[PDB]
Amino acid sequence: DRVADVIESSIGDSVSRALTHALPAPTGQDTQVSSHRLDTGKVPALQAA
Amino acid sequence: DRVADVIESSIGDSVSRALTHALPAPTGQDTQVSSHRLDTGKVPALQAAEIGASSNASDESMIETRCVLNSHSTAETTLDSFFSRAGLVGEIDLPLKGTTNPNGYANWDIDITGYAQMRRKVELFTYMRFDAEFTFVACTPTGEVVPQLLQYMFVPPGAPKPDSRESLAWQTATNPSVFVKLSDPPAQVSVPFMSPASAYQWFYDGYPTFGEHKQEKDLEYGACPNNMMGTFSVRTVGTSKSKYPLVVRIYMRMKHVRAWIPRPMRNQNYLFKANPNYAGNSIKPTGTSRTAITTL
Amino acid sequence: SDRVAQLTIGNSTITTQEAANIIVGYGEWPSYCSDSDATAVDKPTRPDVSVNRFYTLDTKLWEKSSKGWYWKFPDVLTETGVFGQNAQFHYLYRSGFCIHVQCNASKFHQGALLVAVLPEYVIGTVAGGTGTEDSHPPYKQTQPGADGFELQHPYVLDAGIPISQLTVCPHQWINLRTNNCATIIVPYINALPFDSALNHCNFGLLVVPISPLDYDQGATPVIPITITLAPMCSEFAGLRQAVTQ
Amino acid sequence: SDRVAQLTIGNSTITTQEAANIIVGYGEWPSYCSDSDATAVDKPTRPDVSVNRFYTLDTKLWEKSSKGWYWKFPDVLTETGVFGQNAQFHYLYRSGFCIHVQCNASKFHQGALLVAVLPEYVIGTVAGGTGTEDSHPPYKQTQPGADGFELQHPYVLDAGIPISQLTVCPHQWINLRTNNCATIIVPYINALPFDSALNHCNFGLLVVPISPLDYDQGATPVIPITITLAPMCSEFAGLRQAVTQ
Amino acid sequence: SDRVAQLTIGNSTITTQEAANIIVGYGEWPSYCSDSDATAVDKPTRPDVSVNRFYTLDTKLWEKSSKGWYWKFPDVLTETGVFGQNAQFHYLYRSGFCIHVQCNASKFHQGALLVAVLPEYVIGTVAGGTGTEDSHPPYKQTQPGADGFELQHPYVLDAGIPISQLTVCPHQWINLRTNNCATIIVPYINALPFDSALNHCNFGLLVVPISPLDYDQGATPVIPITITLAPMCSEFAGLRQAVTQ
Ligand SMILES: CCCCCCCCCCCCC/C=C\[C@H](O)[C@H](N)CO
């Protein structure tokens, strides 16, 4: 392999790239203490479906 | 200097701030290996021509390429490689019977704008600075070479121009002169840069004299005195009239060339020397035409 | 960031909210003459804040059938304020320039303009229409003043050269879809360190609509164009009487 | 940043200025088959740049009364270019895909589309209307080719399953208020490492207008929809004659 | 960043996408009374989440000929929910406030509003028109309730003071070109640590259209205005029977 198209090639990569992974979860998630918020720039409610 | 307006002032800074700099480039640029891309936020293809700059997209951004080593030279596109080629710039005719120069002498004002092929090349830039090399080819109207003695005199501006074949100005005690035969190879000499300015300019937007510019003084517009380098004079060395008609052709080749400020190349036909005039009725497009835009 | 801009020089200010960056002509800034370049012996005068400030010349209307206009520099400012007085009191002149062109419309209008700077823009004639008459343009066409002049043959730029190659000169575009202003900065361009401001014009400014203006009936039909300029690093020398011609 | 995007693969490029990110189906990227998974002995062929590039199939018009359309993969590309020639010359096939759907309008139009990918999308019949006749759909409906096919009962997806649960599949929306394109990346989905490209269809692409198109009279009434796709990590094996059927 | 905002207090939430920051009146946040300031001996009650939450009073229509409106605090909330019950069961009261005003239109409408908070906004009368009769405003005008009251002479603010100096009070603008909401936070303002909620009004809220509303025929002609408020750091003391008057 001499030409610098075969050396740099990604052909033959058989490993699957996974964006996510599994985590232990035996019980439901807890709920923590929260207070009031009055700020600009943070909008958890506004979404984009 | 005490007030804190003079101390902080930028007045008097004579150094030029340059945004860019020149780099070595003997050969064309190489091409590197590129692969596919699938991303958000990087758009080499999308441009904005309203800024006034050229596109910065490359080969590798748009398609998948291979590694290519480019060894093509860029040495033929320099200014000395482009301009150091002799071309016809003037022609002088010395007939036996006629109305132009029947007395055996002629005067030619040094100019380049007489012929279109070199004029179009030189008028790509605004300012130009170079040395010259003039070659004089002499023969008869049919091309035959005959035994005859000729004299060429260079007359700088302000010097008295000869008025006859036997003028006292042909003593050439100060002006350079050349004596040559028609059986010799063509004569050629070297010429320096003589402009009072730092460069010759082919376009001068203004008038050379002060005062009111009326309509009967309109032939002075665009005339730059810094380009008037003198007069070239020629005669047949003798007291009686010569036996043969003669024609003289001048070729000039630049060397040590510098240029500034490029401008669009000429589009229409030339009409007059030192005049951008064009024919109003017949304006032709830059190129050819076709019947439809959707076909070839 | 690149859309909003402010230009402050002297006692004048310009604010814009729709811009396409600033072009610095030939990659060089205006500056003063050095001792090696200078030839005259008398010391020049540098009035500074009184001459380096923004001037507005006039307003020109853009129609659906416009051809184009051109102005000559520094011929526009030879009659305006302290700059004009200094220019017509002295013999020698040198300075840079900053040019700002303004034209605004709505989101339903369309069009495009080409704003370019061409050094030593010599004007030719139509040679009588047949190329037989060796005429020359009148003084009105060569130096039109601060009112400008309208092109007759924009395709050849009234000088025998194509307009499609005018982009080789420092230039910008005013696309009504994208921006509404153009800013160009020009250094001092000449083969001499100093020159006369009443006999020589350094360059010219061209505004040519490449894409015609269009809109639907009911919208505003008046679309003006305004020119604003400011000298930079001005120098004068050779004091004498005041001559106007 | 997330609005503008560029997709480059092979010798083709796509540019968009109104996007809503890229969905990677099932959180997995296309890849080649490993030695543990492989079963055949002959080495496969990987033509690379000649088959992994964007293809455009056809343009479909969106009306105020449209139902929906569906396409079958890789049945669309079995007749197009080097990919089609390779697919009909070999016996075994495997590859991923990248799907890009385009539809643009103005700021006064409204509507919404659902673009989803459903593996093994089997089509049923209306059973004569009474459930008494055991009919089967013709070959035209099962594999419509590159022209697609229009749904008759979009509520049941022409297969007896609700459309309101189609969001469990990799999907995006094209809201004319927000964006004008949808991009989905699908790996190779099958219970076998290789399969035939002329007998089996891996999945199907559904475009169903959930919210109808609307506009006022005077605006442009033609709103096209265009489909662009590109194979990824294609592999072929089992060379023989060329069969088309 | 400064355009989008979210306000969360108690079990209520407000989301906006067109804002002009939050004004904190007099550069101070609401807080509880300290031991040095306090005078009463009995410990106060702090119900917290049941009284500190957003309340909406009513909707008022903006016309081309509107004058303005005003509300009195805490007179609006003396009949609404747990806050009203606590206020009419106890003798002493103290709290801050958070005020949010909403008004939205299209990109073809124009107008402007001034939203200001004036402590101890006493209302005068026209004195019979000649200044001879020493009358006093009825109880309806002084404490209009949750329905508000419309100004009769907005130039003098119905109290003999110019409106052009109302910007000295904590204020914002609602320019239909720029934003569609205004948020102001007010601490407890009084010369006493505690006071009665049924006899004293701490301040008033003014909404006056300085620039009139305009639009072309065919657009939506109904432009409502809605007021939302929430107490902050409420305290009550002096428990007794429930009195309403
Ligand atoms: C025996 C010697 C004869 C000398 C022949 C003439 C030599 C003088 C040449 C002067 C320099 C040539 C360049 C002239 C200036 C510009 O090129 C032209 N004015 C352009 O119109």
Q: Which of D27, D32, D187 sits opposite A14 (nearest CB)?
A: D32
| Strand ranges (E), C64-109 | 69-73, 92-102
d(CA D240, CA D198): 14
Instruction: State how far the Cα of D139 lies from the Cα of C33, in Å rounded to an integer.
Output: 85
Plot region of E21 (φ>0 → left; ψ -120 to 50 → alpha; else → beta): left
Residues facing residue B250 across a β-bridge: B90, B136
| Residue D194 token pair | 């290789």
The method recorded for this entry reads cryo-EM
Q: 3-state secondary structure string, chain A? A: CCCCCCCCCCCCCCCCCECCCCCCCCCCCCCCCCCCEEEECCCCCCCCC
Q: How far apart are CA C179 and CA C195, in angstroms?
A: 36
Tokens coding B37: 């891309």
Which chains sit next to A, with 3 or more Cβ pairs under 8 A?
B, D, E
CA dihedral in degrees (C215, C216, C217, C220; nearest 10)? -40
CATH of the domain at E234: 2.60.120.20
- Indicate the DSSP class of residue D120: S
Return the SS3 of C36. Answer: coil
Helical residues (DSSP H) of C37-168, grouped into ranges:
81-89, 139-142
Kind and range of the H or E element at D226? strand D223-237
CB pairs under 8 A between A and E: 41
Does B217 touch chain C if contact means CB atoms closer than 8 Å? Answer: no
D85 by DSSP, 3-state: which? helix
> Given ligand 1 and candidates B191, B195, B235, which is best to mutate, with the most ligand atoms within 8 Å of its CB?
B191
**Please, are residues D157 and D151 in contact by the beta-carbon 8 Å criterion?**
yes
Q: Which of D27, D46, D173 sits opposite A19 (nearest CB)?
A: D27
- Return all residues near E242 (Cβ < 8 A) that are at least 6 apart: E85, E88, E89
Helices (H), C37-193: 81-89, 139-142
CA distance B156 to B175: 8
> Is the CB of B138 inside a 6 Å radius of any atom of ligand 1?
no
Are E and A neighbours with ≥3 CB pairs closer than 8 A? yes
Residue B139 CA to ligand 1 centre (angstroms): 22
User: DSSP character for E152?
Assistant: S
Distance in Å, alpha carbon of A38 to nearest chain E alpha carbon: 5
For C57, the token pair is 């010349």
- Give the nearest chain A residue to E12 (CA atoms): A36
CA C213, CA D236: separation in Å to the nearest integer? 57
Residue B257 CB less than 6 A away from ligand 1: no
Side chain identity at residue C204, one-letter code: G
**Yes or no, beta carbons of A45 and E5 under 8 Å apart:** no
Neighbouring-strand partners of residue C100 = C183, C228
Residues of C in contact with B3 (CB under 8 A): none
Both tokens of D209, joined, read 């207008």
Going by C-alpha positions, the residue among D122, D104, D124 that lies closest to residue D113 is D104
User: What CA–CA distance (Å, rounded) separates A4 from C34?
Assistant: 53
B232 lines ligand 1 (CB under 6 A): yes
Nearest beta carbon to residue C129 from set B50, B276, B279: B279
- Model resolution, angstroms: 3.1
Residue with tokens 């009825």: E138
Best of B30, B33, B69 to disrupt the A interface by mutation (most A CBs within 10 Å)? Answer: B33
Sequence-ordered strand ranges (E) for D22-76: 23-24, 55-62, 69-73
> How many Å lie between the centroid of ligand 1 and the Cα of residue B230?
7
| Domain that residue E174 falls in | 1-245
Q: Give the one of B40, B46, B64 whose C-beta lies nearest to D10's C-beta.
A: B64
Cα–Cα dist D45/D95, whole Å: 12
Strands of E23-24's sheet in order across: E23-24, E181-186, E92-102, E223-237, E55-62
At C171, the amino acid letter reads H
Is B188 close to ligand 1, i.e. is its CB under 6 Å away? no
Burial E64-103 (b: 16+ CB within 10 A, else e): eebebbbbbbbbbbbeeeebbbbbbebbbbbbbbbbbbbb
What are the beta bridge partners of residue B91? B249
Q: How far is the CA of C36 from the centre of ligand 1 (A)?
A: 28
Burial (CB count within 10 angstroms: exposed 0-12, middle 13-18, buried 19+), residue C135: middle
**Distance of CA C212 to CAs B22, B210, C100, C206, Å?**
40, 42, 21, 16
Q: For chain D, what is the radius of gyration of the CA atoms?
A: 19
Q: Ligand 1 pocket check: which of B229, B233, B256 to mutate, most ligand atoms within 8 Å of Cβ? A: B229
Residues 116-145 of B with CB under 8 A from D: none
Residue of A nearest to D27 (CA): A19
For residue E213, which phi and psi values (nearest 5 degrees)?
-75, 140
B113 touches chain C (CB under 8 A): no
- C-alpha to C-alpha distance for C159 and C175, rounded to whole angstroms: 26
CB contact under 8 A, D28 and A48: no
> Is some CB atom of chain E closer than 8 A to the CB atom of A21?
no
Asked if residue D115 lies in contact with residue D225, where contact means CB atoms within 8 angstroms, the answer is: no
Phi/psi at C68 (nearest 5 deg)? 155, 170
- CB pair distance less than 8 Å for B48 and C155: no
Nearest CA to ligand 1 atom 21: B111
CA distances from C148 to A8, B174, C152, C157 (A): 61, 51, 13, 15
Spatial separation of the C-alpha atoms in residues C17 and B219, rounded to whole Å: 48
- Determine contact, residues D86/D51, Cβ cutoff 8 Å: yes
Tokens of C87: 């220019």
Distance CA E190, CA E119 (A): 9
The two beta strands, B125-139 and B255-262, are antiparallel
CA-CA distance, C155 to C162, in Å (whole number)?
6
CA distance D185 to chain B (A): 10
Asked if the Cβ–Cβ distance from C130 to B50 is below 8 Å, we say no
Q: CA-CA distance, E74 to B26, in Å (whole number)?
A: 83
User: What spacing in Å lies between the alpha carbon of B116 and ligand 1's midpoint?
Assistant: 17
CB spacing of D1 vs B41 below 8 angstroms: yes
Buried b (16+ CB within 10 A) or exposed e, B125-158: bbbbbbebbbebebbeeeeeeeebebbbbbbeee
Domain count, chain C: 1
| Cα–Cα distance for residue pair E14/E12, rounded to 1 Å | 7
Any ligand 1 atom below 6 A from CB of B136? no
Locate the ligand 1 atom nearest the alpha carbon of residue B200 and give its number: 16
Is E133 strand, coil or helix?
A: coil
Tell me the two tokens of residue D61. 């018009």
Considering only CA atoms, which residue is closest to atom 18 of ligand 1? B111
Q: Is the CB of B251 under 6 A from ligand 1?
A: no
User: How far apart are the CA of B62 and the nearest CA of chain A, in angstroms?
Assistant: 17
For residue B249, how many other CB atoms are within 10 A of its CB? 15
**Calpha distance B51→C227 (Å, rounded):** 18
**In which element (H, E) is residue D111 found?**
strand D110-119
Residue D117: partners with Cβ closer than 8 Å, 6 or more residues away? D25, D99, D169, D170, D171, D184, D186, D203, D204, D205, D206
> E217 burial class (0-12, 13-18, 19+ CB within 10 angstroms)?
exposed
Q: Please tell me whether residue C56 adopts helix, strand or coil conformation.
A: strand
Q: Are residues E184 and E23 in contact, defined by beta-carbon separation less than 8 angstroms?
A: yes
Residue E89's alpha-carbon distances to A5, C229, D10, E198, E232, in angstroms, are 84, 73, 77, 11, 19
Whether the ω angle into residue C74 lies within 30 degrees of 0, i.e. cis, is yes
Whether B35 sits inside 8 A of A3 (CB atoms) is no
Is the pair B, E in contact (3+ CB pairs within 8 Å)? no
Q: How far apart are CA B180 and CA B173, in angstroms?
A: 18
DSSP state of C116: E
CB of residue B178 inside a 6 A radius of ligand 1 = yes
Q: What is the DSSP string of chain B?
A: --STTTSS--TT--PPPBS------SB---B-----EEEES--SS---GGGS------HHHHS----B----B-TTSSHHHHH-S-EEEEEEEE-SSSSSSTTSEEEEE--STTSHHHHHHHTTEEEEEEEEEEEEEEE-TTS-----EEEEEEE-TTSPPP-STT-GGGG-SSS-EEEEESSSPPEEEEE----SSSSEES---B-SS-S---STTGGGTT--GGG---EEEEEESSSSPPSS-EEEEEEE--EEEEEEEE-PPP-S---BTTB----SS----SS---S-SS--
What letters, b where the CB count within 10 A reaches 16 and e where it falls short, cover D201-217? Answer: bbbbbbbbbeeebebee
Of E128, E73, E113, E71, give the one whose Cα is nearest residue E96. E73
Task: Tell me the C-alpha distance between B221 and B275, whole Å.
Answer: 10
Q: How far is the CA of B249 from the centre of ligand 1 (A)?
A: 14
- Give the span between the Cα atoms of E113 and E68, in whole angstroms: 9
B254 lines ligand 1 (CB under 6 A): no
Give the distance from residue A14's alpha carbon to the nearest chain D alpha carbon, in angstroms: 5
Whether residues E9 and A44 touch (CB distance < 8 A) is answered with no
Parallel/antiparallel/unpaired status of strands E23-24 and E181-186: parallel
Cα first-last separation, chain A: 48
Which residue in C4, C193, C233, C242 sits closest to C96, CA to CA?
C233
d(CA B163, CA B101): 12
Q: Which atom of ligand 1 is nearest to the CA of B274?
A: 21
CB contact under 8 A, D6 and B42: yes
Going by C-alpha positions, the residue among B52, B51, B55, B48 that lies closest to residue C20 is: B51
Identify from A2, A5, A9 which residue to disrupt to test chain B contact, counting B C-beta atoms within 10 A and taking the largest count: A5
Q: Which atom of ligand 1 is nearest to the CA of B194?
A: 11
d(CA B233, CA B242): 17
Of residues D170, D127, D190, D195, the one with CA closest to residue D24 = D170
Residue B278 neighbours by CB under 8 Å, 6+ apart: B268, B269, B271, C124, C126, C127, C131, C156, C159, C160
> Residue E194's CB: how many other CB atoms inside 10 A?
22
Residue B189 CA: which ligand 1 atom is closest? Answer: 2
**Cross-chain Cβ contact B276/C123 below 8 Å:** yes
Which residues of E fall below an 8 Å CB-CB distance to A? 1-10, 13, 15, 17, 19, 21-22, 52, 98, 185
Q: Look up residue B168 and give its amino acid.
A: L
Under a CB-based contact definition with an 8 Å cutoff, are residues B37 and D16 in contact? no
